[PDB]
Design an enzyme around this catalytic site. Structure first.
Site, PDB file in Angstrom:
ATOM      1  N   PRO B  77       0.772  -1.585   0.181  1.00  0.00           N
ATOM      2  CA  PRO B  77      -0.049   0.027  -0.083  1.00  0.00           C
ATOM      3  C   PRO B  77       0.943   1.317  -0.070  1.00  0.00           C
ATOM      4  O   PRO B  77       0.767   2.132   0.939  1.00  0.00           O
ATOM      5  CB  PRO B  77      -0.851  -0.113   1.435  1.00  0.00           C
ATOM      6  CG  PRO B  77       0.011  -0.700   2.077  1.00  0.00           C
ATOM      7  CD  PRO B  77       0.510  -2.048   1.333  1.00  0.00           C
ATOM      8  N   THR B  78       1.066   1.777  -1.147  1.00  0.00           N
ATOM      9  CA  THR B  78       1.986   3.080  -1.389  1.00  0.00           C
ATOM     10  C   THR B  78       1.018   4.102  -1.369  1.00  0.00           C
ATOM     11  O   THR B  78      -0.197   4.083  -1.883  1.00  0.00           O
ATOM     12  CB  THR B  78       2.679   2.791  -2.938  1.00  0.00           C
ATOM     13  OG1 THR B  78       1.742   3.102  -3.914  1.00  0.00           O
ATOM     14  CG2 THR B  78       3.658   1.540  -2.811  1.00  0.00           C
ATOM     15  N   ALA B  79       1.218   5.269  -1.047  1.00  0.00           N
ATOM     16  CA  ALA B  79       0.504   6.483  -0.962  1.00  0.00           C
ATOM     17  C   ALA B  79       0.378   6.750  -2.571  1.00  0.00           C
ATOM     18  O   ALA B  79       0.452   6.016  -3.521  1.00  0.00           O
ATOM     19  CB  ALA B  79       1.122   7.534  -0.188  1.00  0.00           C
ATOM     20  N   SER B 106      -3.601   1.813   0.409  1.00  0.00           N
ATOM     21  CA  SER B 106      -3.682   2.344   1.801  1.00  0.00           C
ATOM     22  C   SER B 106      -4.726   3.496   1.701  1.00  0.00           C
ATOM     23  O   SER B 106      -5.450   3.740   0.743  1.00  0.00           O
ATOM     24  CB  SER B 106      -2.400   3.265   2.149  1.00  0.00           C
ATOM     25  OG  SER B 106      -2.421   4.188   3.010  1.00  0.00           O
ATOM     26  N   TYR B 129      -6.100   3.123   8.453  1.00  0.00           N
ATOM     27  CA  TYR B 129      -5.473   4.177   9.172  1.00  0.00           C
ATOM     28  C   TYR B 129      -6.277   4.779  10.243  1.00  0.00           C
ATOM     29  O   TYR B 129      -6.949   5.838   9.814  1.00  0.00           O
ATOM     30  CB  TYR B 129      -4.926   5.103   8.115  1.00  0.00           C
ATOM     31  CG  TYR B 129      -3.546   5.340   7.697  1.00  0.00           C
ATOM     32  CD1 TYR B 129      -2.756   5.062   8.574  1.00  0.00           C
ATOM     33  CD2 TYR B 129      -3.309   5.633   6.436  1.00  0.00           C
ATOM     34  CE1 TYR B 129      -1.209   5.141   8.431  1.00  0.00           C
ATOM     35  CE2 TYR B 129      -1.922   6.061   6.005  1.00  0.00           C
ATOM     36  CZ  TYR B 129      -0.741   5.577   7.031  1.00  0.00           C
ATOM     37  OH  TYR B 129       0.248   5.673   6.917  1.00  0.00           O
ATOM     38  N   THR B 155      -2.106  -0.692   9.905  1.00  0.00           N
ATOM     39  CA  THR B 155      -0.653  -0.285  10.388  1.00  0.00           C
ATOM     40  C   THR B 155      -0.117   0.174  11.646  1.00  0.00           C
ATOM     41  O   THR B 155       0.183   1.358  11.633  1.00  0.00           O
ATOM     42  CB  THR B 155      -0.160   0.685   9.090  1.00  0.00           C
ATOM     43  OG1 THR B 155      -0.482  -0.120   7.809  1.00  0.00           O
ATOM     44  CG2 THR B 155       1.377   0.914   9.187  1.00  0.00           C
ATOM     45  N   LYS B 223       0.547  -4.551  10.685  1.00  0.00           N
ATOM     46  CA  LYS B 223       1.636  -4.151   9.856  1.00  0.00           C
ATOM     47  C   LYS B 223       2.325  -3.326  10.621  1.00  0.00           C
ATOM     48  O   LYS B 223       2.184  -2.143  11.085  1.00  0.00           O
ATOM     49  CB  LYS B 223       0.844  -3.282   8.852  1.00  0.00           C
ATOM     50  CG  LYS B 223       2.149  -2.733   7.737  1.00  0.00           C
ATOM     51  CD  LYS B 223       1.445  -2.414   6.741  1.00  0.00           C
ATOM     52  CE  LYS B 223       2.601  -2.059   5.723  1.00  0.00           C
ATOM     53  NZ  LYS B 223       2.153  -1.978   4.211  1.00  0.00           N
ATOM     54  N   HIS B 247       8.229  -0.030   7.152  1.00  0.00           N
ATOM     55  CA  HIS B 247       7.477   0.974   6.600  1.00  0.00           C
ATOM     56  C   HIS B 247       8.214   1.430   5.377  1.00  0.00           C
ATOM     57  O   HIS B 247       8.359   2.629   5.060  1.00  0.00           O
ATOM     58  CB  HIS B 247       6.977   2.182   7.570  1.00  0.00           C
ATOM     59  CG  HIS B 247       5.836   2.630   7.161  1.00  0.00           C
ATOM     60  ND1 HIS B 247       4.508   2.129   7.722  1.00  0.00           N
ATOM     61  CD2 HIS B 247       5.272   3.824   6.782  1.00  0.00           C
ATOM     62  CE1 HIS B 247       3.446   3.006   7.214  1.00  0.00           C
ATOM     63  NE2 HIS B 247       4.142   4.233   6.609  1.00  0.00           N
ATOM     64  N   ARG B 250      10.814   4.107   6.166  1.00  0.00           N
ATOM     65  CA  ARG B 250      10.266   5.209   6.187  1.00  0.00           C
ATOM     66  C   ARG B 250       9.840   5.793   7.460  1.00  0.00           C
ATOM     67  O   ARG B 250       9.542   7.147   7.662  1.00  0.00           O
ATOM     68  CB  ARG B 250       9.183   5.358   5.194  1.00  0.00           C
ATOM     69  CG  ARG B 250       9.437   5.471   3.689  1.00  0.00           C
ATOM     70  CD  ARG B 250       9.468   6.689   3.240  1.00  0.00           C
ATOM     71  NE  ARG B 250       8.179   6.712   2.635  1.00  0.00           N
ATOM     72  CZ  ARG B 250       7.630   8.097   1.834  1.00  0.00           C
ATOM     73  NH1 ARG B 250       8.300   9.086   2.272  1.00  0.00           N
ATOM     74  NH2 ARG B 250       6.409   8.138   1.608  1.00  0.00           N
ATOM     75  N   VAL B 281      12.388  -6.797  -0.388  1.00  0.00           N
ATOM     76  CA  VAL B 281      12.156  -7.808  -1.384  1.00  0.00           C
ATOM     77  C   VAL B 281      11.949  -7.170  -2.960  1.00  0.00           C
ATOM     78  O   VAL B 281      11.023  -6.838  -3.300  1.00  0.00           O
ATOM     79  CB  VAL B 281      10.707  -8.448  -1.214  1.00  0.00           C
ATOM     80  CG1 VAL B 281      11.268  -9.583  -0.045  1.00  0.00           C
ATOM     81  CG2 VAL B 281       9.818  -7.548  -0.688  1.00  0.00           C
ATOM     82  N   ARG B 302       7.992  -0.014  -3.428  1.00  0.00           N
ATOM     83  CA  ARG B 302       8.561   0.831  -4.382  1.00  0.00           C
ATOM     84  C   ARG B 302       8.779   0.196  -5.781  1.00  0.00           C
ATOM     85  O   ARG B 302       8.308   0.641  -6.726  1.00  0.00           O
ATOM     86  CB  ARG B 302      10.259   1.191  -3.745  1.00  0.00           C
ATOM     87  CG  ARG B 302      10.025   2.122  -3.043  1.00  0.00           C
ATOM     88  CD  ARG B 302      11.420   2.651  -2.269  1.00  0.00           C
ATOM     89  NE  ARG B 302      11.201   3.431  -1.040  1.00  0.00           N
ATOM     90  CZ  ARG B 302      10.763   3.226   0.076  1.00  0.00           C
ATOM     91  NH1 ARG B 302      10.952   1.898   0.681  1.00  0.00           N
ATOM     92  NH2 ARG B 302      10.808   4.148   0.988  1.00  0.00           N
TER      93      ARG B 302
HETATM   94  C1  LIG Z   1       5.272   6.369  -1.183  1.00  0.00           C
HETATM   95  C2  LIG Z   1       4.977   5.470  -0.016  1.00  0.00           C
HETATM   96  C3  LIG Z   1       3.900   5.725   1.055  1.00  0.00           C
HETATM   97  C4  LIG Z   1       4.001   4.615   2.104  1.00  0.00           C
HETATM   98  N1  LIG Z   1       2.660   4.850   2.806  1.00  0.00           N
HETATM   99  C5  LIG Z   1       2.357   3.899   3.431  1.00  0.00           C
HETATM  100  C6  LIG Z   1       1.250   4.048   4.246  1.00  0.00           C
HETATM  101  O1  LIG Z   1       0.430   4.778   4.127  1.00  0.00           O
HETATM  102  N2  LIG Z   1       0.664   2.897   5.404  1.00  0.00           N
HETATM  103  C7  LIG Z   1       1.733   1.708   5.356  1.00  0.00           C
HETATM  104  O2  LIG Z   1       1.488   0.887   6.633  1.00  0.00           O
HETATM  105  N3  LIG Z   1       2.814   1.355   4.447  1.00  0.00           N
HETATM  106  C8  LIG Z   1       2.948   2.526   3.399  1.00  0.00           C
HETATM  107  N4  LIG Z   1       4.345   2.375   2.757  1.00  0.00           N
HETATM  108  C9  LIG Z   1       5.107   1.371   2.736  1.00  0.00           C
HETATM  109  C10 LIG Z   1       4.561   0.081   2.414  1.00  0.00           C
HETATM  110  O3  LIG Z   1       3.206  -0.370   2.602  1.00  0.00           O
HETATM  111  C11 LIG Z   1       5.609  -1.047   2.058  1.00  0.00           C
HETATM  112  O4  LIG Z   1       5.993  -1.491   3.620  1.00  0.00           O
HETATM  113  C12 LIG Z   1       6.904  -0.795   1.367  1.00  0.00           C
HETATM  114  O5  LIG Z   1       7.022   0.110   0.472  1.00  0.00           O
HETATM  115  C13 LIG Z   1       7.854  -2.255   1.160  1.00  0.00           C
HETATM  116  O6  LIG Z   1       8.994  -1.809   1.109  1.00  0.00           O
HETATM  117  P1  LIG Z   1      10.003  -1.817  -0.652  1.00  0.00           P
HETATM  118  O7  LIG Z   1       9.614  -0.632  -1.135  1.00  0.00           O
HETATM  119  O8  LIG Z   1      11.116  -2.057  -0.327  1.00  0.00           O
HETATM  120  O9  LIG Z   1       9.254  -3.243  -1.105  1.00  0.00           O
HETATM  121  C14 LIG Z   1       4.671   3.338   1.845  1.00  0.00           C
HETATM  122  C15 LIG Z   1       5.722   3.413   1.051  1.00  0.00           C
HETATM  123  C16 LIG Z   1       6.073   4.182   0.094  1.00  0.00           C
HETATM  124  C17 LIG Z   1       6.819   3.961  -1.222  1.00  0.00           C
END
Ligand SMILES: Cc1cc2nc3c(=O)[nH]c(=O)nc-3n(C[C@H](O)[C@H](O)[C@H](O)COP(=O)(O)O)c2cc1C
Ligand SMILES: Cc1cc2nc3c(=O)[nH]c(=O)nc-3n(C[C@H](O)[C@H](O)[C@H](O)COP(=O)(O)O)c2cc1C
Ligand SMILES: Cc1cc2nc3c(=O)[nH]c(=O)nc-3n(C[C@H](O)[C@H](O)[C@H](O)COP(=O)(O)O)c2cc1C
Ligand SMILES: Cc1cc2nc3c(=O)[nH]c(=O)nc-3n(C[C@H](O)[C@H](O)[C@H](O)COP(=O)(O)O)c2cc1C
EC number: 1.1.3.15
Lengths: 352, 352, 352, 352
Positions: B77-79, B106, B129, B155, B223, B247, B250, B281, B302
C-alpha cells in the site's frame, strides 16, 4: 525551503571559518580513526520497537544531579568558540537557557566566568583544568561560586593533550586580538594564549581529586573514561555523575567510541552514581541509544559550534530544537512515554 | 534489446518524476541507514541447493487466508501513485488481477475504494489508518464491505510518522489538482491533503484493536513489527497474518531489516497464524529467503511504483512476471517442486 | 618488459572480443554477488608457514583417478571458445597436453569430440549434458569411447540454467557462421545453436545417474555441489571424484563460494572418493588453499579463455606455467616438499 | 609550517625516486593483500586507558639482549638504500647512533660491513643470508666480529623469495654504477648484482642453525615467523630474540599481519626469550600495541627509507624523533610510567 540535517551545518560553517578555525573544531588525534567511529558506532546498535501504544504525550524532562535540565541533551565545553562568531560561550549560555538545559564551558574559554554569566538565569557547568601550581586553580574553582556552575567537569583525560595533526602545519595562530578571557592573563608575580599553553599538571591524581573536594562541593564529575577500572574507582573516591569520553576523539585515537565503551562503564558503577557520555551524539535517534545503555543524559560538542559560527543564537537554537524535536519520534515510535520506559532492555546491539 | 533488472526501473522512472515525486517514493528516515540494509540484508543469507532432481513442474501457487493468490508475491500500500501516472491504484488492481495476486492500497490513496473497485474481479486488501475520532474510520472500515477487501492491513507502526529528510526542503506540494480521493474531503460539520495530514490517533492500542474486531472481521493483520514481544502479543489478541515491516524504512531507521528481524518474529508466534514481510524484496532470489525463514508469502512496495510511473499497466505487469519468472529459477535450482519443500531447513544465514 | 598477473589478461582480452563474447565469458547470475565472492573468498583463509626447511625440490605431480595429471591444476569446460579465437577447444587440448594436465570440454563445444582429438596424445575429460530423449546422449556418452575422455563431468547443476543478465539485452547472437560442432545438428527424423538451446532434461536424477552407469564407466563425476547432503549421497550412489561448483557463479547466485562451501563437502564424503573444486581459482596462492581444505586437485575456467582469445596457444600456455610457476613459491614458503605435506592442518581460515 | 605525519613521506619520496626504486621499496607479494593488512591490522586492537595519574616522567628506555637501545623502536634491514640517496646504510648507522638505537642492515647492502662501520660508535645488527656453499657465509658471519654487530638477524623466511609484481615488468635494472658493496663480488675461483642473485641455499634448516652456532655467538635471531610451531621450536634450538615477520609482506601474501599473528608467537615461547616484530609499525600509537601483546621492542622498515631518500640524515632523524615523540603521548595517556606498566592486560583487541 528550510533545511534540516543536524550536521548539514558542519559543511556550511566549514566555508565560514578560516582554515585554522574549522580544523581546530574539526580535528581528531593523528589518524582520527575514532572520528567516524564516533558516528558509525551507534549504527552497530539495532533498534527494538514495541507497538500499538498511547503516544499522545512523551517526556524528555530530566533531573541530573537534582536539576531538571529541561530535556536530556546537554552541551560539552568547547574551547574558544568566540573565534567562531565573537560572542560564543556568551550566546551559548543564553541559548541553552532559553532551551532549558546546561551550557558547559571549559577553562580554555574566550568569555570568562565573570563575563558570560551576565547572560542571566539558567543552568550551566564549567570544566576544571588543574595546573602546575594550584593557587590559580583553587581560585578558579571557587570562582564558579554562589554564581552557580553547580558541578565541575574535571577533565581526567587531558594531562599531555592529544596530537590532532592539522594544527601544527597550518600553525594555529591564536587570533592576536581575540583572547581567552577565562584567565586571559595570570602569571605568579615578578600572559595569555600560551599561559594557558603555559600551565597544567601532568600528574593529576585521585589524591588531588582528594584535595579538590575540601575546596568545594559542586558535584565533581569524571571527564575522560572508557573503562570500568577507573569507574568503580570513581565511586570508590566520592562523587556523582561521570562524563565518559574520548575528548571529541581529540586526545587519544583508537580508544573505543563512547557508546561502544559504555556498557562496561555503566555496568561497572551500578546505582552508585549516574553516567553521561559526551561524544559522537548528533541525532536523537542515536541519543536514544546512549540512554538505553544506561547513561541518564548526554552532552553535545562540535554540533553546537557549527551552529553559532553558522547563524548566531538561532544556530544552536535549532541544534537543540532539531535535537529535542528528534527524541520525540524516537521515544514515540519505540513505544515509550518518557525516559522511565527506555533502557537497553528495549533494543539490540551488533557486538551482542 | 529488451532490458531486464527489477529496479533498473528505479533510475528510469527517476528521471520521469518531479523531484518531489521521486523523493516521496525514494526516501527513508533521516539517515536512511536501513534503506540499503533492506537489500544488502538478504545478501547475508547464503543459499543451500540440493541436486539431481525432477524440475519439469514447480509451484508458486498460494493460499494466504484461504485465498489462492496466484503466486506468493503481493503488493504493499503505497501512497498517492496517481501522482506517478494519473491512474495509479486504479491500474494496479487490474494489473494484479490479471496477475492473479493482491493489490493492497492504503487510506493515503488517490483513487477511492469506491473508485478503484470499478476495475473489476480480483483479490485486494486495504490499509486501515485509524484517526482521532473513529466515526470516519468506522465507516471506512466498513466501506471495503461486501465489495471485498478481504482483510485490513492495520498499520501498527505509524502514529507519529517517520522523518524522511527530502520532503521538508523540497517542501512536498501535494499537487493542487490531484486529490486523495479515498477520503478526498471529510470534516465533522460546522478539506483534503492536510485533512489526511489533519487526522490520526497517536494512541492506537490493543484495546482499539479490540474495538475494530466488533466492527468487522476482514482478517485484521499486524503491519509494523520487527520483534517477538508484539508477535506472541498478536496471537494473544485474536488475528491471523502479520505484515512484519519497517514501513519501507520510512518510519524508523536503524530498526532491523525485515528479513533479519524475521526469524524471531516467525519463530515467536508458532503455528498460530502465518507471517508476511513486506520490505526490501525486489527479486525472487531474495524472495525465496523470506519464505525460507517462515514467512508464507510476501508483499512488494517501491518496485511496483517505479513501473506504473515508468510504463503504464505493462510497467508493473513485468514487475510481477519478471518477479514470478524469477522464482521459477530459484525454486528449481535449489531442488524444490513447490513451496511445500522450501523452509530454512534448506539454507544458511550469515548471522548464524 | 614481459607482464605477469594471471588475469591482467581479463581486461586485455576484454577489448579483444565483441560485447557479446566478453559478456558470455564475463557474466554471473543476475546480481553476480558470488562473482567477487569467488575471489575475495580465498582471502578469508589466512596462511600458516612452517620454516627453516629443505626446498631444493618440490612436487606438483598428481594422480587423480589413476592419472598423473602433470601438475594439480586442471581445465574447466567453457562453452564456445572458438568464438574467442577460431581454434578454441582445439588448441586447449594441445596446450594442456604440452602442459601435461587435462583439457576438459563441455557438450556446448565449438569443436566436436571427433574434431578436437586430432590434436593428439594427452589426458582430457568431457562434460556430459543429458537431454530430454536420451538416444543422442547415450551415443555422445559412448562417443568419448576408447578415444579416451577418461571420465565424464556430468553437470548436476544445470537443468534450468542461470540468469546471467547481460546476454538478454545485448541479445546473444550465436555467430551465424561459427557452429557448435559437438552436436552441430541432430534432430530426431521428420538444427544447431537452439537445438542445443532445444534439448536437455530438467528432471535429471540419481535414477538417471543409475542408467548412465550401465552405459559406461568413464568415472562419472558430480559437477555442481556446495553441500554435504548430495555429497554423502554421492558415495551412496557409486562414483569417484566430485567437481564442487557454482557454475562460474553462472547458474545460481548467493550460493557459497566453492572454497567456503568446501569444508562441509570434503569433510562429508571421507576417504570414499576425492573432491576437485572448479571455481574462483586464479593463482597458486589461492590454489594452495583448496588443496589445504581437502580437494586433491582443482580445475580452471575463465582464466583459460582470456588467454586463447588473447594470444593463441601461448595464451593459455602461460595461464598454466604462470599458474604452475606460482605453486612452487606457495608450497616452498609454507614448508612443504610436495602435496603430501599440505592439508588444512597447515593453515587458518576467517570463518574459523 | 613544518609538516608531521610519519608516512606523509612515502608519497613525497615517491616522486623522488625512479619507478624501479619506489617499487623496489613499495612492493608486496603479487596481490599485496597483507600490505594494507599491515596497517589496518593494528586498527583492530582497541585502546584501554587508565586515568588520573602522574605522567611528569615516562620511559622508552630499553635493554634488548643486554643492550640499552635508547628507545624501544629499531631499524629493519632494507636492501640497497644507497640507490635511494647514495649514502644509505652509511647515514642510517650514524642516524640511529645519534638516535641511540640499532641500525640493522642486510647482506643485500650497498655499503659493506667494512664500509659502514667507519661511521663510528653505536649499536647495530646485520642480517645473515646463508648461501649454497657456506665458505663465503662463514666468513661474512665472522666479519661482523669484534667490530660489533652484536646479534645476527638470520632470515628464516627467504629461501625462494616472494613474487612482488612490479619488478618484473619494469625490469629492475640494478643501477650499473651503484654496487652491493657487502659482497660486491665473490665467486669461488676459476661478479656482483646477480652473484647475490647468484647465491643462497633453499634448504636452510635447524641443522644449519646448528652449525651457525659453532661459528659464532652473536645472538642468532629468528627472522620470519608467524606461528608457534617454529616458536617453541626456536627455544628448543638455543637462541634468544625473535624477529616475527612477513618480510615487509614481500615474501608471502595472505600470511597474517605481524601484530595479528603475534599473540600465538609470544604466548608460545614463554619467558624463555623475548620477541621483536618488525612489520607494519609506523606510529607509536600502533607501536604501543605490539609491546602490549608481548613483543619487548620492535624494528622499522619502509618508513626509514622514504626518509633518507627524502631528506638526508634529517630524514630518518625525524622518522625516529617523530616516532619516539609519539610514544610519549601513547604511554602517557594510557596511564604508564614506562614499559614496565604496559602489557596486554592494559587493552582490547577486535578478534577478542
Ligand atoms: C510512497 C510510500 C508511501 C507509503 N505509505 C504507506 C502507508 O500509508 N501505510 C503503510 O503501512 N505503508 C506505506 N508504505 C510502505 C509500504 O506499504 C511497504 O511496507 C513498503 O513500500 C515495502 O518496502 P519496499 O518498497 O522496499 O518493497 C509507503 C511506502 C511508500 C513507497
Ligand atoms: C574545539 C574543541 C576543544 C575542546 N576542548 C575541551 C577541553 O578544554 N576540555 C574537555 O574536557 N573537553 C574539550 N572538548 C571536547 C568536549 O568537551 C566534548 O567531549 C566533545 O567535543 C563531544 O564530542 P562531539 O563533538 O562529537 O559531540 C573539545 C572539543 C572541541 C571541539
Ligand atoms: C562461457 C562459460 C560457459 C560455461 N558452460 C559450462 C557448461 O556447459 N557446463 C558446466 O558444467 N560448466 C560450464 N562453465 C563453467 C565451468 O565449467 C567452470 O565451473 C567455471 O568457468 C570455473 O570458474 P572460474 O571461471 O572462476 O575458474 C561455463 C563457464 C563459462 C565461462
Ligand atoms: C627494499 C626492501 C628489501 C628487503 N630485504 C630484506 C632482506 O634482505 N632480508 C630480510 O630479512 N628483510 C628485508 N626486508 C624487510 C625488512 O627487513 C623488514 O621486515 C620490513 O621492511 C618491515 O616492514 P615495514 O616496511 O612495514 O616496517 C626488505 C624490505 C624492503 C623494503
Amino acid at each position: 525551503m528550510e533545511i534540516t540535517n543536524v550536521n548539514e551545518y558542519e559543511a556550511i560553517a566549514k566555508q565560514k571559518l578560516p582554515k585554522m578555525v574549522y580544523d581546530f573544531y574539526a580535528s581528531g588525534a593523528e589518524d582520527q580513526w575514532t572520528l567516524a567511529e564516533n558516528r558509525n558506532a551507534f549504527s552497530r546498535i539495532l533498534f527494538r520497537p514495541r507497538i500499538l501504544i498511547d503516544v499522545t504525550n512523551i517526556d524528555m524532562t530530566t533531573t541530573i544531579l537534582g536539576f531538571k535540565i529541561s530535556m536530556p541533551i546537554m552541551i560539552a565545553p568547547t574551547a574558544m568558540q568566540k573565534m567562531a562568531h565573537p560572542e560564543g560561550e556568551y550566546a551559548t549560555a543564553r541559548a541553552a537557557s532559553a532551551a532549558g538545559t546546561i551550557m558547559t564551558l571549559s577553562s580554555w574559554a574566550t568569555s570568562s566566568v565573570e563575563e558570560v554569566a551576565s547572560t542571566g538565569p539558567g543552568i550551566r557547568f564549567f570544566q576544571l583544568y588543574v595546573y602546575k601550581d594550584r593557587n590559580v586553580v583553587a581560585q578558579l574553582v571557587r570562582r564558579a561560586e554562589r554564581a552557580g556552575f553547580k558541578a565541575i567537569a574535571l577533565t581526567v583525560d587531558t594531562p599531555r593533550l592529544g596530537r590532532r595533526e592539522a594544527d601544527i602545519k597550518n600553525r594555529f595562530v591564536l587570533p592576536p586580538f581575540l583572547t581567552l578571557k577565562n584567565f586571559e592573563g595570570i602569571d605568579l608575580g615578578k600572559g595569555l594564549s600560551s599561559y594557558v599553553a603555559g600551565q597544567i599538571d601532568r600528574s593529576l591524581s585521585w589524591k588531588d581529586v582528594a584535595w579538590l573536594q575540601t575546596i568545594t562541593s559542586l558535584p565533581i564529575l569524571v571527564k575522560g573514561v572508557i573503562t570500568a577500572e577507573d569507574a568503580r574507582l570513581a565511586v570508590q573516591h566520592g562523587a556523582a555523575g561521570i562524563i565518559v569520553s574520548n575528548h571529541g576523539a581529540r586526545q587519544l585515537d583508537y580508544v573505543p567510541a563512547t557508546i561502544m565503551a559504555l556498557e562496561e562503564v555503566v555496568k561497572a558503577a551500578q546505582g552508585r552514581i549516574p553516567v553521561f557520555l559526551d561524544g559522537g551524539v548528533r541525532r536523537g535517534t542515536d541519543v536514544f541509544k546512549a540512554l538505553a545503555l544506561g547513561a541518564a543524559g548526554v552532552f553535545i560538542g562540535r554540533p553546537v559550534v557549527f551552529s553559532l559560527a553558522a547563524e548566531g543564537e538561532a544556530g544552536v537554537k535549532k541544534v537543540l530544537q532539531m535535537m529535542r524535536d528528534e527524541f520525540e519520534l524516537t521515544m514515540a515510535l519505540s513505544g515509550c512515554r518518557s525516559l522511565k520506559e527506555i533502557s537497553r532492555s528495549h533494543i539490540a546491539a551488533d557486538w551482542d
